[PDB]
RNA sequence: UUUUUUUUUUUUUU
RNA sequence: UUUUUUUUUUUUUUUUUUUUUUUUUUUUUUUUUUUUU
RNA sequence: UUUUUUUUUUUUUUUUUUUUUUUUUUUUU
RNA sequence: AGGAGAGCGUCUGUUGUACAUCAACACUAGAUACCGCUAAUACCACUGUAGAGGUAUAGUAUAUAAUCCCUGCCCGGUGCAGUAACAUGUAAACGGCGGCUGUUGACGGUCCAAAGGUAGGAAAAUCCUUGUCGGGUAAUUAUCGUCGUGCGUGAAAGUUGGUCCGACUCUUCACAUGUCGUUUAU
RNA sequence: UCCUAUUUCCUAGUACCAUUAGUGAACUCAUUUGGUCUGAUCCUAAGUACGCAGUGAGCUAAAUAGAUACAAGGAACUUGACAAGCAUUAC
RNA sequence: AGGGCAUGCAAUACCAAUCAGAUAACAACUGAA
């Protein structure tokens, strides 16, 4: 249900991770990076890599993969592959919905200040039922039976 | 039924290639999207946070040990004593604020 | 009717039964009854030096 | 909460809280006298605080006093989308009450009995467990004599029908007090017999002029207000005696009180508490109420009313669950001698 | 000694596994989190760090009352070090002398010279109030809010902040043998100042070493502060070392430079 | 009761966060353990007061006090010096047991005061026959820590140890050997005898736990004979499991030095044994955090001003290099100090000489810079630059390191005192330049 | 309650138009440590209210009984205490 | 037995009730050893 | 719901 | 608005508590009283 | 990784169980 | 689980029932009665606890049911309140409220009583299992509208009801249909 | 000599007890093949670059429990529209 | 009975007002066995 009690935005959250307000500066800060004088403290890279991901904005070019050490996900990695960006069961026409238990499409539209929903069985075919529902909504809008 | 049939043939073919030990090549074309939730992106943040936490804890321990040692270093540590004797600074018995001198006790 | 060893042991155990206003004279397999059981019998023709009879009254 | 030995007391040997500062009690006495004279010098008003004066002051306070015309656009958290519909009534900088949390050092957990006595049986019927509550440490005794205190903010008391106020003394100690309808954040109060007749000020009955609106009247010397504490309630001064003060309560009852006891001047805050209309049973469900079942719909053994069907009628007087009449039946010990009660 | 005693790792309670619902709790636990402590509390906590400021706040009246209001506010707390190293010796000594004078006046109270003292205190109190109040800014401005405002999140403006590289042959010869041989954002004016405050961002020195120890996917192309972090926020050309000090009244940020108004600035 | 929907959400998210946080803390915690061990079979039963009148104190009392101070880490100059003064007075009434305690305390505290060591040594020398294992071990252990070589007495200590071998402890015996090898006071015959006794001791009354302590690169290549070398090397492999990084490092070092110095003995080892060491090197061995010294930094600044590229700190397989040039990696510098030489002398230590020779063998253009020579320059930069430049044009040091000229306590003290003020003036000058001081207030 | 001396100030709402004043505090307990400790201990003794109770000692004491009219519950038989019913309930006797 | 009920009961061995009977395997008339 | 040398004890807090 | 957590312990601050207390394990470093800065 | 132990929190004793056997002249090595 | 007329009607929520097969309880609201602190009331170890660490805009008890609507008469009567130390006041507490006869009949006689059904609804959750007339059908006694006599109900006992609303009876319209005359094949 | 101070710190061999790490209601109950199927999550999946699971033989009788397709009429059935049906058909 | 004889049955009762537990500062505080 689209209840008030829900976030207004649907974007991934990357909240700030502030450090304790009583700790001193890290150890990695004592490094001389000058071309002439070079100084690499112990665990310099270890500390700096972690420290860089504090802000939350500087997630890096490859964020999903710069922290997943587990091989489970790496094993599945692929290169040079085209992928879609839309779920199969998502029609672009407004008012269309799909029900998993009923296994059927529904169309919501308002007529004369009253809510009405129609059934669309998808047993004969997913694409056929989806197109039938989209055509029904378009016919509603064309004939002018939807309030505006 | 047809999809469960085609999957088998595909898998069989791929397995044959793996057995053969041929170079790993796949169908580099437009794949569908059966997923809906951004599980990978949502999952990365937890590891980031965890890492942060770990780092913090490390820092805390480092600081604790350094702090404990610093005070023990030579030339710093001293048997500090009060300048004025505490007895003189002690409040008198007739002080109105002394315990047992007001009808509240 | 659930199975709860905690409940069972906290309400029906050896230390919980003693607090019960029951007839303790009845013999109990898994309980501390108070029924006397008459002990070891008389002696026949064995060695007299090896016949045991007492312990808590004789411990030293 | 506290122990019986720590909470129970009949006789009181003190009516004030003394906090001397000089090394010697001889100097402390002079300091106290100087403070009393300083408060006496400052006191200037001596007229009775009547209903008409109250009204006139309220009209001025709620007609022209409140004018800031502020730039509320900048007073907000930038970059916070917030909820998808859920918004507060008003921002914290324009609300009547404080948008925060009660003080941690001035509160404690509440022990919910659920209307049950020691025996474990239900004693009080129709008693639910609503929203969590915290017991407040309300300072009923004005022990702090000859000292001024300014109001910082006003708080909400779930346990009371009136609002509270955060009082801060010059020394910097924080304390809770019963607020008034007139008192606003910034107003100053003082507890002393030499103080003026103003809202919030606490003075003896005897010192209080006649026909003066008062509240938080104490029964015994230095015990605390018990006779009137609820919102919108107040008492009036009728008569005066050398040792007694005649007061008219909120229930139209005339009673005499000691001349030594303390009392506050003004009206309890939140006068409009009896105007809310609950739109649904959910309000009662959250407040900690339970459904009430009439006895009429009960069995004869359960209730006398049971079985016997009938409308209003005039033959057989009704009987409660306890077997006692509940219409015009006085419930008071006839033997109990009337005390300071004049007119009941 | 109960039904179950497992804790920590072995939590008997069952939690949701759905990433969609999990993504909503992080927002509530980070952004909509409530704080009991006030701004003054936060300020006091770092009294050691900012003694000058800590003392001025409690010394000059008015500032304490102003910094206790329910309305949202943003505060900057310059460091003692910053003050010391920025301020000239004469100005620092003069400021300390007046702070001590006010403290001595209050100590005397609690414990034509008479006419001159009133004028001196009246002028010094106004000067210090003006100085102090300059830092205060209406509204709540978070580190992330500022960062994003500065165009840190815009791909069209992140070109100078994302791709960073350095000579790897000079810092890791063993691992590389083949090589051997932003915009200005204007903030609302302060309480005691009409002039706006410019804010910008800059790239840190550390940011130019991530690729050497991280997986990068860059496309085909055709003094230095020691403070940590990939990005440095400059609020009016004062660097921020610490921030996000959320409170009941607003936010507090520690800057490495004392902001002084034009009214106090010399010719 | 019941909660508001708004509050419910926040509380649940907060709770969840808690769980996440807790999960996120015990990551790096690997080597921890709830259970621990504390040594308690050394404290005395009698009670004493450190803050008491030293005059009323006795040998027993003072002995106790010294050790209690050390254990409690009550580092007080005013307190320690009184102890030393009273000890000097009561030097003629100290039991062997008491002396040992005193020594242990001093050593544990690292109280650098030669005046007391020098005064207590002769009395120890006379009471050597009545000495015991514990006393004998503590003497040497303290001496080693404080870096005060005494070849006259240390040798005697060893000889008494050998005489009382039948009564000594394996641990103390091992530590004595170690100490002796580090101090460099054992002639060939003594060395041989020590080795022969050590082998039997190790093979008869040593376990996994006790054996690990016998591993020392400095000792192995200068005290130990081939027969003991081979047995040590072979048993290390078997006893490797029950070890620590500190012993691992030593083992590796030993291996390296053996390979570099004694090809024959190295070849005499077995294939299996060899493989162990081969594979060992490939592993990552943890190391403690390190940073440049003030002397190091001053030298580095002078070098950089001269116009030469180099590094501050870096590891090279098994050896640390002070300075390494980028244009010519072959080149390297080493900054010495007071600790690099024995007390009141300029003689290099055995570990310093061994590390110098190992790198010289391996082909490292090694240069050394002393501190007593450096201090003389004062706070002048041109003089230091010229000093460095004159060194650079000269050939490197020989394979075999030599000792410096004679010195004295007086000179040492003087030098130290002198340097004290230089290190402070340079810091003040450095720190002052960082302050812009631009802002001017009208007021 | 006595707040910390390093920050005696507390949050408050905006004062109305005609309030002004806002006098400073009087921190007289920061001159000595013992004075502050004694002041806190004295403040810790303060009470809220005094509750009365029945006492036979007093000349005007009394107790309560049953409600006027007697009566009772609807179809309920109350069994009185005894040595064989509800024995040893909240306390021994 | 519940916690509330169990918190107001003594042990049976705390009394003399255990030495006021003669129940045994033989019967109802038990004679103690050495009687 | 307390994380690495053990106890006693005071204020504030993300 | 139906008005919501804090004690054991951690950090910080303030100190005249105490072997009921951290290897007699180990490394590094120019270094410390009074009659050498 | 838990259990054990402080707090919540309870002799609201989980028979044959425990850091729990008489409680420091402990021979410090 | 659709379009239209009409009867009844605060649900959401709890549950299988006070008769003839067609229910209750709870509730937003209003109103009455008791009680000034060691309050009333409840448990019924009585110097106890809950109420309540509350204080007449508070606590508890009884009955009714929408936010509004104009809301009738009667204290002879049990009881309570009061005291001539047994007038008088309480029907939103406590049972209820009618005969002969004369001109369709405003009106006249007489008996009795504290008062002598108010208005509204009205073939009804009630009389009667076919009251007159009109709308639908080839037939309507079923059902809506209406008349107000045939018997009768009856106003904070809750009557009537504009608008809105519906898992509440019934009339009636539309698509498909083996419900069907009347039954087949896989 | 322009760093926010150039302030040594990997890791002590470690008491007693719990544990079959995977799918599956694995709990009371019992007509108990433990594991397949019957419902949401946990993997950016052409169903996861071959995963889990599947128990005697024969035969056109009729009746009964269900599925698909029925000429014309379309409530004439039944107390009652119970039941059944519509919601897929040029692509 | 020469010798030996783990553990559990909650034990200062070979004595001493009563009321929890290794048997409770007064008082609150009560009683048919």
Q: Which residues contact E50 (CB under 8 A, 6 or more apart)?
A: E43, E77, E78, E79, E80, E254
* Structure tokens, F302: 């002078």
Binary contact (C36, H25; C-beta < 8 A): yes
Which one-letter DSSP state was computed for residue A67?
A: S
Per the CB < 8 A criterion, the answer to whether D247 and D217 are in contact is yes
Residues 6+ apart with CB under 8 A from E95: E52, E87, F441, F443
DSSP for D56-81? Answer: HHHHHHTTTS------TTTSSBTT--
Is the CB of residue D244 less than 8 Å away from at least one CB of chain E?
no
- Cβ of D83 within 8 Å of Cβ of A9? The answer is no
Instruction: Tell me the C-alpha distance between F295 and E128, whole Å.
Output: 46
Q: In angstroms, rounded to a whole number, what is the distance separating the alpha carbons of residues F17 and F11?
A: 10
From chain F, pick out residues whose CB is under 8 angstroms from the CB of A39: 292, 311-313
**DSSP-based three-state secondary structure for D204:** strand
A75: the nucleotide nearest its CA (via C1') is M49
Q: What SS3 class is residue D17?
A: strand
Enter the DSSP assignment of G24. P
Interface check D282 vs F, CB under 8 A: no
d(CA F245, CA E257): 47
CB E256 within 8 A of CB E86: no
What CA–CA distance (Å, rounded) separates F299 from F301? 5
Rounded CA gap, E72 and D74, in Å? Answer: 9
DSSP-assigned letter for residue A82: -
Asked if F171 CB < 7 A from strand J, the reply is yes
Work out the angle between the directed axes of helices F226-238 and F245-261 (0-180°, nearest 10). Answer: 140
Question: What count of other Cβ atoms lies within 10 Å of the Cβ of residue D322?
Answer: 15
Estimate to the nearest angstrom the gap between the alpha carbon of F293 and the chain centroid: 16
Pull the structure tokens for residue D25.
């009690």
In chain G, helix, strand, coil percent, each to 5? 10, 5, 85
C-alpha torsion angle, residues B64, B65, B71, B72 (rounded to 10): 160
Contact yes or no for E85 and F10 at CB 8 A: no
- Hey, how many other C-beta atoms are within 10 angstroms of the C-beta on F248? 18
Using the structure, give the distance in angstroms from the CA atom of E149 to the C1' atom of M71, rounded to a whole number.
Answer: 79
E138 DSSP β-pair partners: E73
D314 CA, L111 C1': separation in Å? Answer: 28
Q: What angle do CA E76, E77, E83 make, to 5 degrees?
A: 120
Identify the CA nearest to D310 among candidates D302, D318, D301. Answer: D318
Residues 6+ apart with CB under 8 A from D175: D106, D139, D149, D166, D167, D168, D169, G1
Contacts 24+ apart (CB under 8 A), D81-86: D81/A7, D81/A8, D81/A9, D82/A8, D83/A4, D83/A5, D83/A6, D83/A7, D83/A8, D84/A2, D84/A3, D84/A4, D84/A5, D84/A6, D84/A7, D84/A8, D85/A4, D86/A4, D86/A5, D86/F6
Nearest to C18 by CA among C39, C32, C1: C32
Q: Which of D163, D188, D228, D152 is nearest to D43 (CA)?
A: D188
Give the whole-angstrom CA distance, residue D161 versus residue E48. 45
Phi, psi of A117 (to 5 degrees): -130, 140
Rounded CA-CA distance F304/F385 in Å is 9
Cβ–Cβ below 8 Å for D152 and G11: yes
Q: CA separation (Å) from G2 to D174, E57, G32, G35?
A: 7, 20, 16, 14
| β-sheet bridge partners, residue D134 | D109
Instruction: Tell the residue number behind the tokens 């040492």, with chain if given.
Output: F412
Subunit contact B44:A85, Cβ cutoff 8 A: no
Question: Which one of H4, H5, H7, H8 would you mutate to disrupt binding with G, by most G Cβ within 10 Å of its Cβ?
Answer: H8
Minimum CA–CA partner of B90 in chain G: G34
Instruction: Transcribe D235-267 into DSSP letters.
Output: EEEEEE-SSEEEEE-TTS-EEEEESSSEEEES-
Query: Considering Cα of F239, then F244, then F247, then F248, what sign does the dihedral take?
Result: positive
Tokens representing A37 are 């004088």
Of F307, F343, F345, residue with least CA distance to F326? F307
Q: How many CB atoms lie within 10 A of CB C5?
A: 8
Burial class (CB within 10 angstroms; exposed 0-12, middle 13-18, buried 19+) of F147: middle
The nucleotide closest to D116 (CA, C1' atoms): L50
d(CA E58, CA G9) in angstroms, rounded, equals 9
Beta strands in chain A (DSSP E): 37-38, 96-99, 104-111, 114-121
Select the residue of A14, A50, A87 nearest B33 (Cβ to Cβ).
A87
Q: Which residues of A touch E170 (CB under 8 A)?
A: 35
Q: How far is Cα E130 from Cα E194, in angstroms, rounded to an integer?
A: 12
Query: Taking the CB of residue D330, how many other CB atoms lie within 10 A of it?
Result: 6
**Using CA atoms, how far apart are residues E206 and E225, in angstroms rounded to an integer?**
10
**Residue F91, class by beta-carbon neighbours within 10 Å (0-12 exposed, 13-18 middle, 19+ buried)?**
middle
Residues 215-244 of D with CB under 7 A from strand J: none
Q: DSSP states of F105-160 as a string?
A: HHHHHT---HHHHHHHHHHHHHHGGG--HHHHHHHHHHHHHHT---HHHHHHHHHH
Residue F156 to residues D51, F70, F127, F140, F176: CA-CA distances in angstroms?
Answer: 108, 27, 11, 11, 11
Tokens of G37: 């400790």
* Partner C, chain E 1-30, Cβ-Cβ below 8 Å: 2-3
Plot region of B31 (φ>0 → left; ψ -120 to 50 → alpha; else → beta): beta
How far apart, in Å, are the Cα atoms of F11 and each of B43, D87, E114?
22, 19, 59
Answer for the pair F232, F214: CB distance below 8 angstroms, yes or no.
Answer: yes
Distance of alpha carbon D40 from alpha carbon D34, whole angstroms: 10
Distance of residue B31 Cα from the nearest chain E Cα, in angstroms: 22
Task: Please give, rounded to a whole number of angstroms, the shortest distance from the CA of G28 to a CA of chain H.
Answer: 54
Give the gyration radius of chain F's Cα atoms: 27
CB F335 within 8 A of CB F295: yes
> Counting beta carbons within 10 angstroms of the beta carbon of residue F314, is it exposed (0 to 12), middle (13 to 18) or buried (19 or more)?
middle
By DSSP bridging, strand F365-369 and strand F331-335 are parallel
CA atoms of E40 and E196, how far apart (whole Å) = 25
The CA–C1' separation of F40 and M13, in angstroms, is 18
In angstroms, what CA-CA distances link A91 with A82, A107, F215? 21, 11, 75
Task: Measure the CA–CA gap between F175 and F140, rounded to whole angstroms.
Answer: 8
Six-digit token string for F393 = 């044009």
Report CB contact under 8 Å: G13, D8.
Answer: no
Specify whether the CB–CB gap between E28 and F8 falls below 8 A. Answer: no
Q: Cα-atom radius of gyration of chain E, to the nearest Å?
A: 25
Give CA angle at F132 (F129, F137), nearest 5°.
Answer: 115
F1 touches chain D (CB under 8 A): yes
The CA–C1' separation of D8 and L60, in angstroms, is 26
Give burial (CB, 10 Å; 0-12/13-18/19+) of F369. Answer: buried
- Nucleotide with minimal C1' distance from the CA of F70 is J19
Q: What distance in Å separates the CA atoms of residue H11 and residue C18, rounded to the nearest whole number? A: 6
Judge contact between D164 and D179, C-beta under 8 A: yes
Show the tokens assigned to D244.
């007694």
> Coil, helix or strand for B39?
helix
Judge whether residue G87 contacts strand N, using its CB and a 7 Å cut-off: yes
Please tell me whether residue E244 adopts helix, strand or coil conformation.
strand
The answer, yes or no, to whether C and H have at least 3 beta-carbon pairs within 8 Å is: yes
G80 touches strand N (CB under 7 A): no
Cβ-Cβ contacts under 8 Å for F377 (sequence gap 6 or more): F383, F384, F387
Q: CB of B42 within 8 Å of any CB in chain E?
A: yes
- Strand K contacted by C9 CB (< 7 A): yes
φ, ψ for residue D170, nearest 5 deg: -65, -35
G43-75 burial: b if 16+ Cβ within 10 Å, else e: eeebbebbeeeeeeeeeeeeeeeeeeeeeeebe
Closest C-alpha among F335, F333, F314 to residue F392: F333
d(CA F153, CA F123): 11
Are A39 and F289 within 8 A, CB to CB? no
Name the residue facing B53 among F25, F74, F77 (closest C-beta). Answer: F25
Using the beta-carbon criterion (under 8 Å), do D14 and B92 form an inter-chain contact?
no
C-alpha–C-alpha distance, residues D96 and D179, integer Å: 13
Contact call for D75 and E141, based on CB within 8 A: no
Closest by Cα among F141, F208, F430 to F298: F430
* Residue of chain G nearest D97, judged by CA positions: G13
Q: What is the DSSP letter of D342?
A: E
Q: Are D306 and G76 in contact (CB under 8 A)?
A: no
How many other C-beta atoms lie within 10 A of the C-beta of residue D334?
Answer: 7
d(CA G28, CA B97): 14
The order of strands in the sheet holding E240-246 is E137-138, E73-76, E250-255, E240-246
Determine contact, residues E98/E128, Cβ cutoff 8 Å. yes
Burial class (CB in 10 A: 0-12, 13-18, 19+), E111: exposed
Sole residue written with tokens 């000269």:
F394
Q: Are D249 and D344 in contact (CB under 8 A)?
A: no
Q: Would you say E244 and E252 are in contact if contact means Cβ atoms under 8 Å apart? A: no
Could you count the other beta carbons within 10 Å of the beta carbon of residue D303?
20
B91: DSSP letter: P
DSSP calls for E157-221? G-HHHH-----HHHH-TTT--TT---PPEEEPPPTT--S-EEEEEEE-SGGGGGGGTS-------
What are A97's strand-pairing partners? Answer: A106
How were these coordinates obtained?
Answer: cryo-EM
Residues of G in contact with B87 (CB under 8 A): none
* Cα–Cα dist D254/D246, whole Å: 7
Query: What's the CA gap between G88 and G82, in Å, rounded?
Result: 10
- Kindly tell me the sign of the dihedral angle through the C-alpha atoms of F218, F221, F226, F230: positive
**Chain L bases near protein Cβ (<7 Å):** 11-12, 18, 24-30, 32-38, 40-51, 53-58, 60-64, 77-82, 89-96, 155-158
Give the CA radius of gyration of chain G.
28
Distance (Å) from CA D106 to C1' K6? 28
* Nearest-angstrom CA–CA distance, E69 and E39: 10
The DSSP code sequence of E120-132 is: HHHHHHHHHHHHH
Contact G42, D144 (CB under 8 A): no
Cβ F81 vs Cβ F106: under 8 Å? no
3-state secondary structure of B24: coil
B91:G34 CB<8 A:
yes
Q: Give the residue before each break in chain E, using a C-to-N cut-off of over 2.5 angstroms; say none if it is continuous.
A: 111, 181, 222
CA of A101: nucleotide with nearest C1': M39
Contacts of F32 (CB under 8 A, 6+ apart): none
Residues of D in contact with B97 (CB under 8 A): 19-21
Q: Which residues of E212-236 are buried (b: 16+ CB within 10 A; e: fewer)?
A: bebebeeeeeeeeebbbbbbbbbbe
Residues of A in contact with E213 (CB under 8 A): 45, 48-49
CA distance F56 to F62: 10
CB pairs under 8 A between A and F: 31
DSSP readout, D114-174?
-SB-TT-SB-SSS----B--EEE-B-----B-S-EEEEEEEEE-TTSSSEEEEEEETT--E
How many whole angstroms separate alpha carbon F247 and alpha carbon F172? 18
Kindly report the length of chain A: 148
Both ends of chain E: CA-CA distance in Å?
78
Give, to the nearest 10 degrees, the angle between helix F151-163 and helix F170-183. Answer: 150
Are D258 and D221 in contact by the 8 Å Cβ rule? The answer is: yes
């Amino acid at each position: 249900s689209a209840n008030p009690y829900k976030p207004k935005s649907r974007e991934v959250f990357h909240p700030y991770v502030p450090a304790p307000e009583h700790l001193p500066p890290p150890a990695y800060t004592t490094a001389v990076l000058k071309p002439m004088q070079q100084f690499i403290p112990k665990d310099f890279y270890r500390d700096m890599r972690v420290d860089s991901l504090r802000d939350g904005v500087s997630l890096g070019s490859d964020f999903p993969w710069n922290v997943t050490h587990k091989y489970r996900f790496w094993r599945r990695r692929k290169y040079n592959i085209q992928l879609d960006d839309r779920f199969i069961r998502l029609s672009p026409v407004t008012g269309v919905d799909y029900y998993p238990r009923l296994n059927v499409f529904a169309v919501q539209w308002r007529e004369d200040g009253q809510h009405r929903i129609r059934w669309f069985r998808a047993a004969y075919g997913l694409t056929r039922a989806m197109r039938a529902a989209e055509n029904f909504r378009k016919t509603l809008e064309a004939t002018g039976r939807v309030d505006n | 039924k047809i999809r469960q049939r085609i999957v088998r043939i595909r898998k069989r073919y791929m397995g044959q290639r793996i057995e053969a030990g041929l170079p790993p090549y796949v169908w580099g074309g437009p794949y569908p999207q059966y997923g809906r939730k951004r599980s990978l992106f949502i999952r990365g943040e937890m590891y980031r946070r965890m890492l942060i936490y770990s780092f913090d804890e490390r820092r805390r321990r480092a600081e604790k040990l350094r702090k404990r040692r610093q005070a023990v270093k030579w030339g710093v540590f001293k048997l500090r004593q009060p300048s004025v004797p505490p007895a003189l600074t002690a409040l008198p018995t007739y002080h109105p604020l002394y315990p047992g001198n007001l009808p509240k006790r | 009717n659930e199975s709860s060893p905690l409940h069972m042991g906290a309400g029906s155990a050896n230390w919980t039964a003693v607090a019960r206003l029951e007839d303790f004279t009845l013999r109990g397999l898994s309980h501390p009854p108070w029924i006397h059981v008459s002990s070891r019998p008389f002696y026949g023709a064995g060695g007299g030096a090896v016949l045991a009879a007492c312990m808590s009254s004789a411990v030293w | 909460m506290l122990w019986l030995a720590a909470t129970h007391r009949n006789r009181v040997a003190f009516q004030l809280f003394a906090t001397p500062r000089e090394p010697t009690a001889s100097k402390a006495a002079a300091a106290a006298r100087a403070a009393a004279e300083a408060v006496a010098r400052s006191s200037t008003v001596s007229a009775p605080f009547t209903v008409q004066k109250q009204q006139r002051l309220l009209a001025l306070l709620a007609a022209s006093s409140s004018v800031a015309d502020p730039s509320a656009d900048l007073f907000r958290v930038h970059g916070l989308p917030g909820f998808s519909g859920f918004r507060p009534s008003s921002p914290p900088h324009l609300s009547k009450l404080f948008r925060g949390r009660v003080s941690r050092h001035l509160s404690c957990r509440r022990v919910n009995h659920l209307g049950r006595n020691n025996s474990g049986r239900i004693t009080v019927r129709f008693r639910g467990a609503g929203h969590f509550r915290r017991l407040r440490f309300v300072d009923y005794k004005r022990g702090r004599k000859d000292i001024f205190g300014t109001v910082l903010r006003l708080e909400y008391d779930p346990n009371r029908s009136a609002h509270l106020a955060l009082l801060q003394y010059d020394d910097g100690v924080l304390s809770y007090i019963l607020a008034t309808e007139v008192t606003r954040p910034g107003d100053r109060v003082v507890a002393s017999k030499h103080a003026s007749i103003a809202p919030g000020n606490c003075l003896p009955l005897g010192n209080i002029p006649v026909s003066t609106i008062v509240h938080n009247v104490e029964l015994r010397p230095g015990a605390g207000g018990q006779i009137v504490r609820a919102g919108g309630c107040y008492a009036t001064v009728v008569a005066k005696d050398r040792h007694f003060v005649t007061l008219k309560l909120s229930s139209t009852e005339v009673r005499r009180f000691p001349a030594d006891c303390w009392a506050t001047v003004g009206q309890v805050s939140n006068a409009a508490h009896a105007e809310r209309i609950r739109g649904k049973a959910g309000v009662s469900y959250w407040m900690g109420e339970r459904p009430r079942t009439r006895g009429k719909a009960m069995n004869p053994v359960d209730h006398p009313h049971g079985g016997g069907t009938g409308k209003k009628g005039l033959k057989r007087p009704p009987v409660s669950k306890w077997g006692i009449l509940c219409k015009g039946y006085k419930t008071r010990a006839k033997k109990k001698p009337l005390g300071l009660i004049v007119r009941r | 000694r109960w039904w179950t005693r497992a804790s920590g790792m072995r939590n008997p309670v069952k939690w949701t596994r759905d990433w969609e619902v999990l993504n909503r709790k992080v927002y509530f636990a980070f952004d909509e989190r409530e704080i009991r402590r006030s701004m003054l509390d936060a300020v006091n906590a770092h009294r050691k760090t900012a003694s000058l400021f800590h003392r001025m706040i409690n010394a000059v009246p008015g500032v304490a009352h102003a910094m206790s209001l329910p309305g949202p506010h943003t505060f900057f707390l310059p460091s003692d070090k910053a003050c010391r190293d920025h301020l000239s010796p004469d100005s620092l000594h003069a400021l300390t002398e007046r702070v001590a004078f006010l403290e001595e006046q209050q100590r005397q109270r609690v414990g034509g010279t008479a006419a001159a003292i009133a004028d001196r205190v009246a002028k010094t109190t106004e000067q210090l109030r003006t100085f102090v109040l300059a830092h205060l800014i209406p509204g709540e401005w978070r580190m992330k809010t500022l960062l994003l405002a500065c165009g840190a999140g815009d791909p069209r403006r992140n070109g100078s902040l994302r791709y960073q590289d350095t000579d790897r042959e000079l810092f890791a010869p063993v691992m590389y043998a083949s090589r051997l041989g932003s915009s200005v954002f204007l903030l609302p004016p302060p309480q005691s100042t009409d002039e706006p405050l410019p804010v910008w961002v800059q790239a840190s020195r550390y940011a130019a070493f991530l690729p050497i120890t991280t997986s990068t996917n860059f496309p085909r192309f055709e003094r230095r502060s020691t403070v940590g972090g990939a990005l440095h926020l400059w609020v009016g050309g004062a660097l921020v070392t610490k921030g996000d000090l959320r409170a009941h009244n607003g936010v507090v940020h520690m800057i490495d430079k004392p902001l002084i108004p034009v009214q106090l600035l010399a010719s | 009761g019941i909660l508001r929907p708004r509050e419910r959400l926040l509380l649940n998210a907060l709770k969840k966060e808690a769980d996440i946080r807790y999960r996120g803390r015990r990551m790096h915690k690997r080597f921890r353990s709830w259970a621990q061990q504390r040594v308690r079979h050394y404290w005395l039963p009698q009670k004493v007061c450190v803050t008491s009148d030293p005059q009323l104190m006795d040998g027993s009392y003072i002995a106790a006090c010294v050790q209690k101070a050390a254990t409690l880490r009550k580092h007080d100059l005013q307190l320690w010096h009184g102890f030393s003064k009273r000890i000097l007075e009561l030097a003629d009434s100290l039991t062997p047991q008491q002396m040992g305690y005193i020594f242990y305390g001093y050593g544990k505290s690292l109280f650098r005061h030669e005046e007391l060591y020098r005064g207590l040594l002769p009395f120890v020398a006379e009471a050597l026959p009545e000495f015991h294992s514990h006393a004998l071990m503590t003497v040497a252990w303290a001496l080693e820590r404080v870096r005060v070589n005494d070849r006259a007495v240390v040798a005697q200590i060893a000889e008494e140890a050998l005489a009382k071998k039948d009564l000594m402890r394996p641990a103390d015996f091992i530590k004595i050997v170690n100490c002796v090898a580090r101090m460099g006071a054992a002639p060939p015959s003594l060395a041989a005898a020590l080795s022969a006794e050590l082998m039997r001791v190790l093979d008869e009354k040593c376990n996994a736990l006790l054996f690990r302590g016998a591993v020392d690169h400095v000792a192995v290549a200068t005290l130990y004979s081939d027969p003991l070398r081979l047995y040590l090397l072979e048993r290390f492999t078997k006893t490797a499991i029950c070890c620590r990084p500190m012993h691992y490092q030593k083992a590796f070092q030993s291996a390296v030095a053996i390979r570099v110095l004694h090809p024959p003995v190295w070849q005499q080892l077995s294939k299996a044994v060899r493989n162990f060491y081969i594979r060992l090197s490939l592993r990552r061995i943890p190391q403690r955090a390190r940073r440049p010294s003030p002397l190091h930094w001053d030298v580095s600044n002078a070098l950089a001003k001269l116009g030469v590229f180099h590094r501050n700190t870096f590891q090279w397989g098994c050896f640390w290099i002070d300075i390494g040039e980028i244009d010519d990696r072959r080149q390297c510098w080493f900054v010495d100090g007071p600790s690099d030489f024995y007390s009141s002398t300029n003689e290099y230590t055995e570990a310093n000489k061994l590390q110098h020779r190992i790198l010289s063998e391996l082909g490292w253009n090694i240069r050394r810079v002393r501190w007593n020579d450096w201090v003389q320059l004062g706070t002048d930069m041109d003089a230091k630059v010229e000093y460095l430049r004159k060194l650079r044009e000269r050939p490197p040091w020989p394979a075999i390191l030599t000792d410096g000229p004679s010195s004295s306590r007086q000179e040492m003290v003087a030098n130290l005192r002198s340097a004290r003020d230089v290190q402070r003036a340079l810091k003040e000058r450095r720190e002052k330049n960082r302050q812009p001081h631009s802002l001017v207030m009208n007021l | 309650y006595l707040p910390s001396g390093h920050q005696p100030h507390a949050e408050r709402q905006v004062f109305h138009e005609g309030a002004g004043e806002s006098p400073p505090l009087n921190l007289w307990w920061r001159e000595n440590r013992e004075l502050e400790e004694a002041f806190r201990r004295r403040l810790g003794e303060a009470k809220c209210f005094e509750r009365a109770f029945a006492d036979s000692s007093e000349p005007l004491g009394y107790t309560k009984g049953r409600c006027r009219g007697g009566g009772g519950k609807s179809g309920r038989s109350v069994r009185r205490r005894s040595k064989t019913h509800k024995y040893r309930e909240n306390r021994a006797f | 037995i519940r916690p509330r009920k169990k918190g107001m009961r003594l042990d049976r061995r705390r009394s003399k009730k255990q030495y006021k009977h003669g129940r045994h395997v033989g019967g109802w008339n038990y004679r103690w050893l050495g009687s």
